[PDB]
Structure formats: C-alpha cells, structure tokens
Subunit: 330 residues, 4 copies
C-alpha cells in the first residue's frame, strides 16, 4: 500500500481524499493544513457539489478517524517540519498551491517523504505528467506535477487527434465552472480584474493553465495550440471546445471512430466517448479526464473541425493525481 | 413617424416596445397577444433583466396608455383578423415565433399592414437582413426577417475580417445566455433533449444555424463558416468566439485596427470596440449588436486567430429590428 | 410485492420511480405519459439534480427494460384507457397533476387498478395523508392523496411541538427551491404573475396552502397555522421556518429533546434531527420529510420560538408516496 | 456643500459614491483604499449589479477625474495619516469594516475630518441612527453609525407597527442576497462554518446584524424582537419576513392603511408601500430602505401577523448613509 500525506485540504485535497477511499493500493495517513481537526471533519463530511462523505468521520484527540482509521492532523506552515517519516508517508499530495517549485516542494523530502506530486502546474521545470499523454515518459523523478484539470482534458484528446490525423494548428476554449479564486460579488482581484467580477452574474473571459502546457507534455505539439477560458456560473464540470486544422483529411465519422477506439482501448479510463444528449451535470463525479461528446462537435470540412470534450475539473483531476502517485511508485 | 404593431409580447416584443419609446421615428400603436391588458402592463412595467419601465403605464378599458399614448390591445390568434388598418399600422413586428413563412406572415398584410418584419430567421425563402452586413441589398420586399441575435453578432464581425484579410474558413461557438425556451428543472423538450435540462444547473450544448445563416446575408462566406452554442446560467448577454483562418497575414494589432476603424466609421452603432476588462453584465442593455473584445482574443500566428465579440441578445437584436423597420420604410 | 403504475413522468414520477428501485415491497410495472420510451429512458438515465440512474436502462420495441425488468410504456391521455389490469397494477401513483378529484382519479380504477395515490393535494374532499401525522387514520379508502412536500415537512414537526407544548398559533415561511412550474426568464404565468418572473434572478413570494392543509391532517391544529413561501434560485431542497407561540413554557433545550426523542422513536425515518452546521445541499437526496436544524432555530423566550426544518422536496415526498402506497395495501 | 471622504472602496463605498453623484448637498472629494487609481476607476465604471457608471471616469496623475471633478486617491493603511484637512473633508464615510469603534474611527478626526459615519454597526457604544427610527435623537455626536442594511429595513417597519398596534413580541427572518463575505465554492470560513459553503448552490442559515440592534435604535422594543437570516443565490436585494404578536387588534386592511399612511407621509422616502406583484429584482436600485409588500403578507388573526418588506441591501443603505451625513451636518 502506498502511504500518502496530503498538504492542503482545499477542494483538490478533499476530493483526492475521497477518491483514495475507493482505492486499495493507496491509503491516506495524514493531512496537513491550517484548520482544526473538527473543521476538517466537517469539510470532509459535507460537500455542496459531491454530497455526503461515504463513510464515518470522527475526531479523537485532535486527529481524524475516517472509517475507523486514524489520520494524523497537523497545521505546519513550513513543510520542512512535517515529520512525514513518523507516519510512514511514501508520497505527498502537494495541494496548497504554495509549493510549485523543486526548491519549495523538496522540503517534503527533507521532512521524510520519498516523493511529491504537485496538484497543479509547476512554476519551474518540475516535469509534468498527464495520463494518456506522457505517463510513459516518467523516468524515476522524485518530484512531479500532474499539470492542471484543463490540461488533463485537452492533452489526451489532442494526442489521439494528432497521432491519427496530424494537428497543423489548433485553438481551444474551455467553458469553465466557477472556482474558489473567483468572487461572489464584484470585489478586489488586482492582478486579474475580470476575475474579481461577481461569478454567479457573469460570463468571465480568463486565461488558461492549459495554453502553456500541452506543449510541455506533448512536445510534438509545442507552438501548435493555444487558447483561453470563459468562466460561467456553474459550480463544477467544464468543457473543452477544440478547433483544429488537420493534416490528413478525416470525415467526422472517421474522427469519431478513432476517438472511440482510444477510449475503448489504450486510453480506457482516461478518455471517454459518448453519443448521448449529455449536459454538464451528467459528468459531476466523472473519473475520466476527457469525455468526447460526439454529437456536440461539428466539422466544417475534412480538414477543419471543432471537437468537444467534458471534464469534472475536481473529480477527474483528483483521480489522476492518485494515478500519478501509483505510477511513480511502481 | 412609422406606426408599428407588435404581434407577440414575449421577451423580444417587450424589449422592442421599450426600445421604440426612445426613438422618434417609430411609434408603437397596437399590441396583439393572448394576454389581458393588465397583465401586459405588468410585464412591461417590471423586468427582471432590464429593470422598471422608464415611464408611465396605465390600463384603461382593456387597452394600454403608455406615456400618455393609447395602445390598442387585441387577442387574435389568427393574424388575418387583426384589423391593422384601423390603427394605421405601417409595419408589423412579427414576434410570436409562429409566422415565419411568407404564407403565414402575409396574413398581417391581408389585415391591412403594409410590411412585416419577422423577429427571427424565416423558415422559407423570405429574405433575411442584418445591419452592417446586407441592409443595402434590401429591394422593397414587403415581408422580411431580421435573422437572429447570434447572426447579428457574427455577420458584422465576419464581414470586417473577410473584407480586410479574407476568411479561408471559420468555426464559431456562442456562449449563450439562458432563454425562454429552456426549463427551470429537468423537463420535457422532445425535439431538443439537452435543451430540456435544468438551465441554471448546466452548461448545455446546442445547435445554432446562425453561422451558416451568415452565408445567406454574406454570400461570399457561404459554406465557409459554421458553429454551435453552449447555453449557460446567465439571464442575458452572450458572446461569440470566432476561430478563423485568414488569407492575408495580419498581426493581432492589425486586426484590432481594422475592427476599430469599422466601429468608428462604416459600422458605427452596429460594431463596437473595447479594450477594457469587460464581463458579460457590462453589456446588459447594449445597443451595438457586436462588441469586439480586443483583450480577450488570441492569435496563434498571423493566419489563425480567435476573436471574441459580445452581444446583448435581447437589446441589440430588438434595436436592429427597429432599424430594419425604418430601413424598409425609406 | 405491490405492483405500481405511474401516471406522469415529471419530477415526482421519475423520483418515485428511482426510489421504488431501492424497495423490495414495491415494483413499478408500467409508466404512462405523452413521451416516447426512448425519451423516457433518457430522462430516467440522466438527472441534473440526483445524478445518473443507478442501474441499466434499455429501450426495446417501444417499452422500457430497467435493471432487466420490463416496464410497459403507454401514452394515453384518458386514464380510463390505461388497461392497468393487463399488467396487474395494484396501485396507481397519479403524478400528472391533472386528476386531483375523485371523479378524474377514479378512471384508473375503471381501468383496472385497485387504488390511487395522488402525488399532490386533492382538489375535492379526497382524504390526504402525511406520514407521521395521520397515516393511522387511513380507513380503506380506494383513492387518497399524499398532500404536498411542504405539508410533509410541517405536519410532523407541528405534531411533535403541539403534542409536547401546545401550539397556540403559528405562522410559517418556506424558503423553497425552484420548481418546474417556474420560468427561466420573465414569461407568461397568467394565474400567478410573480411565478412567471425569471426563477434564477429572483426571490419570489408565493402562496402556500400547506400550512392550512396541516389542519386537514392534524385537525387539532385547524385554524391555528398558516403561512407563505419564497421561491429562490436553487434547484432542489427547501426549508420550513416555523414561528409558534406555545402554551407550556419550554426552553430551547427542551424543544430539542422532544424533537430528538420523536426522531429516534415514533417518527423515525420521517422526522430527523441534526446539530451540525448544515446547508441545503446537505439534504439533496434526503429521505426524511422533515429534518430539524437545532442550531438554526431561535427562541425569543420560553413561549415564542422560531423552528427550522429541512426537506428535499423531491426525494422525501417521493419516498413517502411509496410509504402511502404500502400503507394502504396492508 | 458637504465635502466627504470615503475610506474603503468596497461595495458600500462604491454605491455611496454613485448615490452622492445625484445629490447637490454632498460632494465626494477623496477616496482612500489599497487600490491603484486606475483599478478604482475600473470598479466605479463597471458594476455587475447596477450597470455602467452614469458619467465619465478618467485617471490623471494618480487621481480620479469623475465628471470633470478631481478626486484625491490615497492608499493609507492608518487613518491617522489621511490628511483629510488638505482636501477640506467635512465628513468621512468609514466603509472599510475595520474601524467600528470610537478609538479607531476617531483617528479620522485627528487626521482633520470633523465627523465620521460608520457604514456598519458599531462594535462599541458609538450611537447608531436609522432614518425613520431615531434620526431625531441625534444630538451633535461627531462619530455615529448607520447600523446595517437589515436594521434599516426592519426598524422603520417595526416602529410604525409598534406605534400603532403595540408589538408584544416578534421574530424575524431576512431572506438575504449573497454578499462579499461568502465563498463561490465550499471553502474556509473557520468562524462561521455554514458561511463557507458555496453561495450559489445553497440556502445558508446565518445570524443577523439586525437582531442585536433594532433594540438599540428603538429602545422601547429592546428584548422584544430577534431573528436570523437565510443567505440565498441572488446577487442583491433582500426581504424581511416579520412575524409579530400585537397588543391592539388590527385587521390586515388596517395594518395596510397604517403602513401606507406612514409611507405617504412622515416616512416618505424611507418606508415604501406597494400592492403590485413584485419580486426581488423590482427593487434593484431602490432607494427606500423598507418597501412593504401588502400582497405578500398574511394574517392568521387580528393579533398575529406576518409582514413582508423589501430592501436593496446596497442602494437603500448607501443612500441613507448620505442622509445621515446630511443630518449630522445640519
Ligand atoms: O499516454 P501515456 O504515456 O500516459 O500512457 C498511459 C496509458 O494508460 C497506457 O496504457
Ligand atoms: O447593412 P449594410 O452593411 O449593407 O449597411 C448598412 C448601412 O450603412 C446603413 O443602413
Ligand atoms: O402517520 P402517523 O403519525 O399516524 O403514524 C405512522 C405510523 O407510525 C407508521 O405508519
Ligand atoms: O424616525 P426618525 O427620528 O428618523 O425621523 C425622521 C423622519 O424623516 C422625520 O421626517
Ligand atoms: Na484507500
Ligand atoms: Na511549521
Ligand atoms: Na417612439
Ligand atoms: Na422495487
Ligand atoms: Na454630489
Ligand atoms: Na498609513
């Protein structure tokens, strides 16, 4: 069993915690954040988006008891003090957003952990791995990044299209759920003015973490794709809208056949495929990081097409954080 | 002064009514719908999206008195019984969505009106007109269509871009506000299954003919553009996301200059231009049918760009319906 | 096993269907609505509020196969043509909202059913039953009504409070989720003008008969309670705010104990009790029809208190419809 | 003209700024906050709730030019350094939420201002004044509080009811719009756990600033009223639901007559009165701090009644802040 410590109990930390409960190969043994244990128990037990925790949560002597198992709770601001070794932690899910470089994240290894997975794109050259794009390029590094939710949707789709038909160039939009960095009513956001406008009232243009990044996990596409985002008033689930010009001519039916084949074979559990009349709530809780929507897409011609793929930006990403933890521990 | 009768007091009929109050060249003299006058007065007086009516509304003996002017209220299901000549109606704003062919709309002319403007795309070969695209092709026809809100956004922008740089091909997405045909919670929508899903909970993919319809008002672009829509949980204002390949290479600065020049000249009051950090609510009440958002767009290279343009799908369209009424009356 | 036919596949019909899958004593064998089987299958399979159906749904030759069981699909507008006897239906869940009198609902019995449960308050003197208030008064009638979601919340709480402390008088407000009769943007609602205003934009005052209806299922309280509703922009879950004057003085701790004792005993599974910091989404999917929120309530003094109780207006009501079906079949 | 400085450019500061533009007796001459002038100009120009600023906003040499008038912009954290005297400031609108005691707010007077109005309830015994409740008790104090939005709605209504019929006891609920202290998705709120839950997803029980406070501005009601709040997913406008037991019997028509009389006479411009089918958006922009909704209320009997009153929690309060500034300067 891989013993895992979570640093940061925000949305990603908490959904990683829930996803880990369904996995026999990974056990969460410790959580660190600036929250009392009883407040941590409350945030785990009740979730507006995902419902009640499936299990029991109790607080005893300042720690969590989840499904009868004790979880060490700490509130260290400095990761070097986390004493991960005392709880036998193998891998740290680094989920605070505060330690996205090798120098800061490596303090976890001085605190006794063996490896670190950052739950966002690195701010230095820490390598990023995205399942269904480049997990097979992993080569023993002890600190890695799972990139971002949107990158986990875009890159597996882009890889299948590129490998089969050749992407000459592409532009993408993500119609993206509201996140925790937005504001409930117009308020201060001095480094991103649009992002301070009231989230439930507005469609909000925004820049995307995936524009800088598919090129890093799929170097053959570097320079060939960029894009942007629109934040809209839903609480979870987002959708990629990818417009590509293709080298090899392909009818929409041939594109569908290729995506379906990857979803049913090599990329099973990463890329999904549907022909149903789905909407965003149909993916709330979805584990696949990229669900191709066959009926939503449209081709102008055999070399110019708009492809649509869904992702639960909380659940898919969180599940793939756990996949990366397992992958780097094999 | 052109005397106008409104058939249908839904969103477009009521916003056309409000817009007409601010115009001296057009006077609403009659409204027809299956609603009592006192309910019509209530719908006019209070608007969740646009606020309280700017003026006085009185009900007197089953008719309306708005800003001191008497407005004849009728409730005919068959437009041939409307007796438009008895109030001197010149043009009918046909806003029920029910009479979108020449045979049905022509009943208004049998009822004594001289011309009909359909407030939606025609379902037969009735000619469509979009200001800033093809008002100048109008040739005296007595029944016309103002196309759709989305077409009114896309076509003026597409024209400026094509005229300056040559559109090889393009695909568009409109991120679109919730409309009256949607449902508050999952409910029956048997000819558009996704469209019945709860509007406030979902991002909802939807078909749009608007990009192709651009081919009808801009024949030089016929076959060169198509697209789709995502309905999202905002009550008004939508945004077009246009991905185009260009024949002539152009820097983003050159695209900005071309759009600004059109917004300040030939297309003034139709196409707008901003470099501010705007969000959708900043266009609630906007009269321009296409406001180019310079900072939101992105160029991958000199021949492949994503352009962003806002529209108030109620206010802009409604104002251009009145513009078409005045144009065909010259 | 009681065989049940559902007339009407709206929110309540579909949630009653889902709830029945989890019960061994009741089996749905037929559904009637003016919807094709494949559209019914789609509405069952995907739910914006409650997620994907837990099981398999197949359409075969115009009928449904759900979890391997065949379900007869019909589309009769007249319930007298329903031939309920041909599938052995014992009880009809009458969920169209259209047959709320003895004369209309009795057509199901002419069609071969033995008993009818209306999933809303009757419009004539058809008896109403609310679990935890008056199931024990049921006297073999062949047509009954399960009252309304709000009545199912208020009556069990009102009974515990009255039985223990004596309600002199009370007024209630339900802060109520958006429902299917509302509109996505301001639209026609000619018998309830406020109710046509855009549901996601507004707090909407609304009349409720539910508090008076408590007088029908709790005659000792007849004339002692009334109230109203505010519709707000959430898709599910509502909350009752009950302001009562008490005959016997009682501290808030004593009210808590009385409610907890009922929730743990006589009213187990109907009335619930929590002291957690809950919000509405924590009851999405709740089966109890009245969850008392101990921390939210407030006492001004020992005889004047404001009590707060949650209900999932879809799930709780739907489950108690099945409870009434089983009760009248004993 | 009263020269006014605003400390704090949050929602209240910005709407006070807009309301002051429509008043000839008050001129804003300076704003202090930790925001650059160009960002302040952006927040003034665009508002998701209230639309575009009615006027011109320019930035010149680090200060604002609003409708041609220069506004001194500063970013002092310590009010004692604000040098209000250099701009001739008479009264400070103290709108940061950080200086709600005499000792902290008085630093404005050492910085050269003559008087201070706190735009929230004081945390010490700084006297509170609410128009239509106790403005006439003002007796020359140089630091005062305008209490809170909900208190400005509740107290004028309570005064009219008490003066005419005698409130024996009452309990209130405010169904309250989302505010800036809430979170867009479930996030940390360690001193108010429910308040951290996602605001657009939830009905959120909350405590009220008006429960501690009508008793302070109407001492005759101290101990006789308390209440709580439900936060719901609307961006602005709230409603008070007041359940009172009355000393003198009064029919609902007599209560209506009394409220209407106050709204048309002594309390004109503070208390409003309507019999229309209004919803919350009908008061977005409303200046009255308490608009009685005659049709929404309900009487159980002549001594036990539920009264409903609307308030724009941004605009009404902000206008009355300006009224208090004028009042203490007379
Ligand atoms: O595309 P990659 O390198 O992540 O490969 C991972 C696939 O799951 C192989 O089964
Ligand atoms: O609509 P267009 O482009 O033909 O031009 C409109 C004219 O400038 C004024 O009607
Ligand atoms: O509904 P009541 O209160 O008569 O009681 C219900 C019984 O306990 C079980 O049906
Ligand atoms: O009720 P008060 O003391 O605020 O009196 C203020 C009224 O506006 C008097 O006209
Ligand atoms: Na596990
Ligand atoms: Na530390
Ligand atoms: Na006019
Ligand atoms: Na069953
Ligand atoms: Na002024
Ligand atoms: Na300072």
């Amino acid at each position: 069993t891989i013993k895992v410590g979570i640093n940061g109990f925000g949305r990603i930390g908490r959904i990683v915690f829930r996803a880990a409960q369904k996995r026999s190969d990974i056990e969460i043994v410790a959580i660190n954040d600036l929250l009392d244990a009883d407040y941590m128990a409350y945030m785990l037990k009740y979730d507006s988006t995902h419902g009640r925790f499936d299990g029991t949560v109790e607080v005893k002597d300042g720690h969590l008891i989840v499904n009868g198992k004790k979880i060490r709770v700490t509130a260290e601001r400095d990761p070097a003090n986390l004493k991960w070794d005392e709880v036998g932690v193998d891998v740290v899910a680094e989920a605070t957003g505060l330690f996205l470089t090798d120098e800061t994240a490596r303090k976890h290894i001085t605190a006794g952990a063996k490896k670190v997975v950052m739950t966002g794109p690195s701010k230095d050259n820490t390598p990023m791995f995205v399942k269904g794009a480049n997990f097979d390029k992993y080569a023993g590094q002890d600190i890695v990044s799972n990139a971002s939710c949107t990158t986990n949707c875009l890159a597996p789709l882009a890889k299948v299209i590129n490998d089969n038909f050749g992407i000459i160039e592409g532009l993408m939009t993500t119609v993206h759920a509201t996140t925790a960095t937005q504001k409930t009513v117009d308020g201060p956001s001095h480094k991103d003015w649009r992002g301070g406008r009231g989230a439930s009232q507005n469609i909000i243009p925004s820049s995307t973490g995936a524009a800088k990044a598919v090129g890093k996990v799929l170097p053959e596409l570097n320079g060939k794709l960029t894009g942007m985002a629109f934040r809209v008033p839903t609480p979870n689930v987002s959708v990629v809208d990818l417009t590509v010009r293709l080298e090899k001519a392909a009818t929409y039916e041939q594109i569908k056949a290729a995506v379906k084949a990857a979803a049913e074979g090599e990329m099973k559990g990463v890329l999904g495929y549907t022909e149903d009349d789905v909407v965003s709530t149909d993916f709330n809780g979805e584990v696949c990081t990229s669900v191709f929507d066959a009926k939503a897409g449209i081709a102008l011609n055999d070399n110019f097409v708009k492809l649509v793929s869904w992702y639960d930006n909380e659940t898919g990403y969180s599940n793939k954080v756990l996949d990366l933890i397992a992958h780097i521990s094999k």
